[PDB]
Amino acid sequence: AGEQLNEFSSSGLGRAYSGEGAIADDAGNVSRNPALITMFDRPTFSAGAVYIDPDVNISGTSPSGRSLKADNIAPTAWVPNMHFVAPINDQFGWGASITSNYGLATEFNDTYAGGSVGGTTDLETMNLNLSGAYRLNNAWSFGLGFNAVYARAKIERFAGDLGQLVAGQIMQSPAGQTQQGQALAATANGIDSNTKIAHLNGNQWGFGWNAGILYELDKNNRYALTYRSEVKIDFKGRAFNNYGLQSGYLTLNLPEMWEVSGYNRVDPQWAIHYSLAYTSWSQFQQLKATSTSGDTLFQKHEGFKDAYRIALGTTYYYDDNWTFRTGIAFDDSPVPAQNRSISIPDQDRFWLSAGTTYAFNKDASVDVGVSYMHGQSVKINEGPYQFESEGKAWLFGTNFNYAFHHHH
Ligand SMILES: CCCCCCCCOCCOCCOCCOCCO
Ligand SMILES: CCCCCCCCOCCOCCOCCOCCO
Ligand code: NA
Ligand code: NA
Ligand code: NI
Ligand code: NI
């Protein structure tokens, strides 16, 4: 939900990210549950990317009379992933990954009437993870990971029609009957809609941790509990070399997430897998801007917001070479209209997914996945404006998998 991204692997994409704490058919899942490291008996690599093509549209009419229509506000994106896992001994293993689990991009024309809450918002994050795991016995494994997150932001806001709203208010007041009041209203109305009123561009690192437990009933059936911590990102605004002769502030808290997962291989050729994930934020979505020495201070309201996601999928292990998968998911995000933001797509999301993997041999394989996401149409009440939003997306991904130390 919200800015969350689940796109850590292309096999996961084909399953609608169902039971991802409990499946370990490739290296990608260690990033989702570090305890899964104990399911690997040789160094294993995976890398790939997911292309996301959203279609998000805003509609409405301002109290000024101006249109709030904005089509196609969410651009396409590529989300890469790379994973490595290796055993150390019978009891221990480690892994590393580069993924993203948070990101946002919307863009409105700079003459948009709702520009004070529209403009541009681009948040990109890269999660570097190092994880370790311990196998206690045949049933129990435990994992712990540490995360370094590199976050880039670009945020711009514009006057839009605010001056027109002010002008109207002045004209409606007793001041509207005076020459001075009329002049003030004209001054307000004269403000260009593309006047920039807030700006942030920045790059910052933050840190967090994650952990996981894995319980195996047997080689065919297992369950997992995982936790991912919040990550706090604090954006803040030679000579040598000549041979002798970042703007804006914002504290952003990435959300914490708990997830339970199950995987049951009910037949040599069939598995089911499912999960419930619970995400909480310590901030609301809307932004307030002030300034200090001409630099923008952005602030989100400190408040508790949550969401949950349920997912169910199945994997058909057809033969030695071919695996097929499908899944369905629902991500429920119950944000009140008055707490939503046009700059941040947020709505209930329904997933339908399908995928396949082709294994060239026991060491090497390729995954291809596709998902369709249907977004709920929602009302948004932000600042002086009322909007409606509609959204959907297609996602396409491919990964290559390779396990080292071929021998026989
Ligand atoms: C309840 C909100 C108050 C009224 C809603 C605004 C609808 C009408 O406002 C139109 C704003 O246009 C700004 C032009 O300002 C007037 C300038 O010319 C008037 C000469 O005195
Ligand atoms: C590539 C990984 C290397 C980065 C490892 C650094 C990890 C250090 O950050 C751990 C602390 O993170 C803060 C957790 O957020 C608060 C909740 O947990 C705090 C309770 O101890
Ligand atoms: Na589009
Ligand atoms: Na319109
Ligand atoms: Ni709902
Ligand atoms: Ni050989």
Swiss-Prot record:
Q: Please give the Pfam families that the UniProt record associates with this protein.
A: Toluene_X
* Topology in the lipid bilayer: Multi-pass membrane protein
Residues in coiled coil: none
Q: Which GO BP terms sit in this record?
A: long-chain fatty acid transport
What is one term from the GO cellular component aspect held by the record?
A: cell outer membrane
Q: Which GO terms describe its molecular function?
A: ligand-gated channel activity; long-chain fatty acid transporting porin activity
What does the induction field say?
A: By long-chain fatty acids. Expression of fadL is under the control of the FadR repressor.
Q: Which UniProt keywords apply?
A: Cell outer membrane, Lipid transport, Membrane, Signal, Transmembrane, Transmembrane beta strand, Transport
Question: Which InterPro entries does this entry report, sorted A to Z?
Answer: OMPP1/FadL/TodX
Subcellular location, in the record's words? Cell outer membrane
Which Gene3D superfamilies has this protein been placed in?
Answer: Outer membrane protein transport protein (OMPP1/FadL/TodX)
Provide the family line.
Answer: Belongs to the OmpP1/FadL family.
**What does it do?**
Involved in translocation of long-chain fatty acids across the outer membrane. It is a receptor for the bacteriophage T2. FadL may form a specific channel.
Q: How does it assemble?
A: Has been isolated from outer membrane preparation as a homodimer.
Instruction: Report what the protein is called.
Output: Long-chain fatty acid transport protein
- Organism (species): Escherichia coli (strain K12)
Query: Taxonomic lineage per UniProt?
Result: Bacteria, Pseudomonadati, Pseudomonadota, Gammaproteobacteria, Enterobacterales
